[PDB]
Structures are given as C-alpha cells and as structure tokens.
C-alpha cells in the first residue's frame, strides 16, 4: 500500500513541480513529514490503475476533467473543508471539483489557452484564423513563420474546432447529456477542415508537438504560438518580447478553449488524508504557497481570492480570462477521457492525411461514447509472412473465434498497409504432445499460488520489489528440471533469436476460463528482466493482444496450443501485451521465462550486488 507518515504527490511535468516541492520543504521543516513531489509520465493514466489496488500517490494534481472518472470508482476521498476555508476560494472553482454533490478535490488555478505572439515580428496579431495563411506567406518570405503550436494534443486544437459549433456533450436541464455528442457536426468539421488545410498548404507541420512549437517561439522563429500560463516562465527567460491576447475568431465566431481548473485530489487509499488536508489547505492554498508554485511556472487565475487580488493586474491573466470567457469549463464526467482519446485520434489522423476530416470525426463521434483501444488501428498477425495485416473485420472487442478465423484468412490478403513488429517471434508447434505431457506432469506435482486477475502461479526466481529496486533470494533455490530441455530446444530451433538465454525467472501462469482469468495490458519490468520474454502455451492456446500507444496500433497474435512466443526489441520496449479474459478457453498454463537484464549480467552495475548471485541460483535445478 501507501506508506504512512509521509506524502507522495503527483503533478504533471509542465507545471511548477519544483515550486511545489519547495512548499513541501516548508511542510517538512514545520511538521517533520517528508513530502516527495513526482512528475511521472502519463500520471493521469497510472493513477486509476495503482489507486484501485491501494497504491499510488497520496495527492494527485490534474485539471478537474479527469476527476469524475476517478471519483466514480471511489479513488478520491471526499474532502471536508470547513466553511471558513471554503470561503477563501472562488465558488465557481469549487463547482468544478464537485461530483454527485460531493467535493472531490481542492481547486488550485484556472487555466485557458491564449494566443501568444512575438511583438517584434508581429506588432498587430491577426483577429481571425482566416488571415493566417496570408500572414504566413508574408513571414515565410522573411525567414519566419506565422504560427506553431502543439498539434498532438486535442486540447490545443479544440478552441478552433468548437468555434463554429463543435462540442463535447450538450448541457441540458442541469446535467451533461452523454447521449448528445457534438464532435462530428458541421461546426466541428469546418474547424478541423481549416486546420488540415493549414497543414496541406504548408503553413503548419502535422508533426509539430509541444517542445517543437515552444522552442521555435522561444528562439524567435515563429510569430505566434498557442499555450497556457505554465508556458510563460520559459518565454520570460528567453526575453522574447511577447504578448498574450485573445485567440483568433473562426467563421466570424470566437475560438472556444476548454477551460481547466488545476485540482488536487486525495487518494482514497491514502492513510495520510489528514496530512494531505493540512498540506493543501494551510501550506499550498496560501499566498506564500501559491507564490512559490507561481514563481516556478505560472498557474493562471488562482482559486484563492487573496492571492488572485495580488495577481489581477497581470495583463497575461486578463487575456487568459478573456479567452476563458469565450470557451467553457470542461465537464468532469467520466466520459471526458473517452471524448479526448477520440478527438486526439481524429485530429492526428486527419492532419496526417490518413483519413478525411469527415471520417476521422465520424469515428471520434462514435468512440466518444465508449478503453482507449477502440480508437486504434487493428492488425492481425500473419505468422507465415511474419507481418501484421490491417483488418477492419476485427476490433478491440473481437472474439477469439473471429481472431482465429482472421489469422488464417489474412494470409491471402495484399500486404498493403501491413507492418513489421521487430522482435515478435512465433513458433507454431514448439512442443510435441509428449514433451508437453512430460512438463505438465512435472508441473502438477508442484504447489500453485494465488495471484492477480484469477491466475495462479508457480514462481521460480527471486522476490522483487520493483518499486524500491530490492531483491530477495531467500525463496530462489533454482529453476524447474524441465528448464534445460526448453532452453536447448530454443537454441536448436533458432540460435540467433532464442539462444544464449540465461533464465533469471521462470514463472508458470495458470488461467481458467471458469475463473475469468486474464492478464491486463502491460510492459514487463526492464530493471531486472532483459530483452527477450518467452511464453509457451500449455494445454490450450490463446491470443496475445499487442498495443502501441505511440502509433495507436492494436495487433492480435493468435498463439495456438503448444506454441512458443518470444517478445523482444521493438515488441518488448515499444508495445504492451496482455491476454484478455474472453480469449481464454478451458485451462491454459503460460510457461514463461525472463532473462537477465544488462545491469545484472557479467558486466553490469548490479552484477556484484545481485547479478552474480542470481546467475548461480538460476544455474541449479530442482528435481521433480
Ligand atoms: O496515448 C495517447 C495519449 O493518452 C494520454 O493523454 C490523454 C489523457 O490521459 C486524457 O486525460 C486527455 O487529456 C486531456 C486533459 O485531461 C485535459 O486536462 C487537457 O490537458 C491539458 C491540461 O489541462 C493543461 O493543464 C496542460 O497540461 O496541457 C494539457 C494538454 O496537453 O487536455 C488533454 C487533451 O489534450 O486526453 C489525452 C489524449 O489526448 C497520455 O497522457 C499521453 O501521453 C498519450 O500520448
Ligand atoms: O502469456 C501470458 O499468459 C502472459 N504473459 C506475459 O505477460 C509475458 O510473457 O510477459
Ligand atoms: Mg508480460
């Protein structure tokens, strides 16, 4: 679980986490309680997975739109400010962190996108999006460009998409109606069409992301960007003569940015809820606390009335709230993340030209009512040609029967649009029936242990605290007797791919269809386990589901009974794998192996502390 007596805090990497850690020091200096501020990548996706097992940070910072999904599953403690503390923050900020009539987080700051422009290049910024193409031709002739901003996150393109009519969910009768989505109406297509036309006409590049746009603006190479308050600190230190103003209109109408309230939720599994309440209320949500965070990266219009008064004069804040007035505060309902996931894909796919605007927004409309796999392009693995074949017969919910059908049908299909997955290897009939019987009779002489998600396990190897990087070898007395016959047979079949394999862990995983056993999508640890992950299908076959978030690809790999799978290189480091429960039939044992990581092998950094000991134990054999 979560350690008592200290506070662990998650906040995104674009916010002032170093200022927040300074508030944590003042907390530690006063209370002796250590505060540790972390900025994990994808923290907003990790928090629901680790909080639901009783783990994670005591306090999570994000915009409020994420928090209704968390609260729905019970991952956020109700917060209990007294009336005097409630009166210290603007009421509208409290309403952004209300879910089913309960306060679920503290509001910190109000954020909205603005147009940021270089006054020395562009003293009169455009009032309209429509005049940017001609603005770019003028500036292109002078070695500059008009406008660069993050095209990879729909947050930055949403103001333009909403402007002429796009919306997430209609607000009607005091509620958000999830049955009425507006991402494929005329207004949304008009705005995304304009964005895609800007890219077709080379006024923007569909690959531009947050860091590329920020550097270009901050080096003085583009006349405009679009960003929020957290970005101003980096502009300041580059001494570009910038201003902050209203976003341009589109088709005569204002751009409508989704307004975020940066918010602090308290993990429901936390045993430190009183310490978190003390920190947030009397250390962070003070003039001195907010100033420390603001001096690192600006927060926007803070929720605390006293410190906002001291900030009202700032013209950048005034422009932020002018844009906020033209947009809307985001919903916080659970479906907001499905909305964003869907719109993220439409924008990427239309901008790249892979899909037209109409079909990209038609797909996002459908998926905004949904599991981010629904948005990915689906492939089936052709084990003969050893490529993944794009298929529209399969989706993220396809049955085992449909996947098995497709994995033979796909072999007579054109290779167009196919991909290779480097380091995916499938060996169809690795074990004979009698070798499998031999191993299975040995395995069922050994005790099974209860594990996660309806699996049982036999574990041969060290106890590993992955989070603390600590290893115990008390339980590690060797590898199972059948390890040699497997390792030799791996070397005989394909020495280049499966040889020189020193098993650091062998682990049998038992699935039963009656128990709904499964294993969630994951990447296996890369601190102690090395490149090649081996899995051998005993008793029954199944499907390894592979996903690539970076590319939005979903690939089904049918693993027939007695096949060997090896996931290495790209397949191991760029993709996730898992076994969905509805792809298990009867009983299956996955006979898995990990090899040593490089830090643990004969020339690594932890070879002396752990690696040499693990090699000795892994060389001895347990008789059956
Ligand atoms: O692999 C796809 C991507 O999935 C992950 O990003 C998701 C998030 O998990 C979703 O929550 C959502 O993100 C929203 C976000 O909730 C919303 O607040 C706003 O984010 C702003 C933020 O308010 C602002 O303070 C500042 O930090 O910039 C953010 C925008 O970058 O808008 C987001 C949508 O753009 O949707 C995305 C998917 O788009 C994962 O984190 C990604 O690494 C991953 O690539
Ligand atoms: O094969 C299975 O059932 C699940 N296996 C893995 O996640 C793996 O081999 O790393
Ligand atoms: Mg795995």
Author numbering: -371 to -2, 33 to 286
Quote the authors verbatim.
In summary, we found that NMAD-1 is able to directly bind to and demethylate C. elegans actin K85me1 (equivalent to bovine and human actin K84me1) in vitro and its deficiency dramatically increases actin methylation level in vivo. Our structural and biochemical data revealed that NMAD-1 assumes a typical DSBH domain and contains a highly conserved catalytic site for the metal ion and cofactor binding and actin demethylation.
To better understand the substrate recognition and catalytic mechanism of NMAD-1, we determined the crystal structure of NMAD-1 truncation (Δ1–31, hereafter referred to as NMAD-132–291) in the presence of Mg2+ and NOG at 2.20 Å resolution. The N-terminal flexible region (residues 1–31) was removed to facilitate the crystallization. In the crystal structure, MBP contributes to crystal packing but does not interfere with the cofactor binding or constrain the overall structure of NMAD-1. Apart from the metal ion, the recognition and binding of NOG are achieved by hydrogen bonds contributed by the sidechains of Tyr173, Asp186, Ser197, and His239 and salt bridges by the sidechains of Arg250 and Arg256. Flip2 is mainly composed of the β6–β7 hairpin and protrudes from the surface to form a positive ‘horn’, which may also contribute to the substrate selectivity. Notably, the CTD locates beyond and stabilizes Flip2 by hydrophobic contacts involving Tyr272, Leu276, and Leu279 of the CTD as well as Pro124, Val133, and Phe138 of Flip2.
